[PDB]
Amino acid sequence: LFYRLCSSKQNRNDLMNTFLFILSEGIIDQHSLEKVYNIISSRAMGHAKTTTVRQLPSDCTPLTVANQTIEILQSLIDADSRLKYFLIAKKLRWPLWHLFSLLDRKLITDESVLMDLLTRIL
């Protein structure tokens, strides 16, 4: 579904931006994960922040969210051909550097699967 949506320029840009935002300020800690989840839920509802009361699922942890996000992003990069160009195109302005930040987080560096997928993307 995400690959199909990528055929649209606006949808592709928005989806990539949301992916990078999640991976940047989402996979830090449980509280940060909850904050980003509330932000995303409010965005889906129609506004930016609004109410900030949304309990996270019990089984949802930064590990699983990071795994799913990185898996989807790697699949998109492998399938689509114009996404890597978007990634390539203060250093946080360049989208690619966001992925670089992940190398400084214990949650990511401690997982073989996450490391493999991130290394494939890079």
Swiss-Prot record:
It is found in: Nucleus, Nucleolus. It comes from the Eukaryota. Interacts with the ADA3/NGG1 subunit of the SAGA complex. Interacts with KRR1. Belongs to the UPL family. TOM1/PTR1 subfamily. Probable ubiquitin ligase protein involved in many cellular processes, such as transcription regulation, maintenance of nuclear structure, cell cycle, mRNA export and rRNA maturation. E3 ubiquitin ligase proteins mediate ubiquitination and subsequent proteasomal degradation of target proteins. Involved in transcription regulation by interacting, and probably mediating, ubiquitination of some subunit of the SAGA complex. Required for SPT7 ubiquitination. Participates in mRNA export from the nucleus by regulating the transport of hnRNP proteins. Present with 350 molecules/cell in log phase SD medium. This is E3 ubiquitin-protein ligase TOM1. The chain holds residues 2482 to 2624 of 3268 of the full protein.
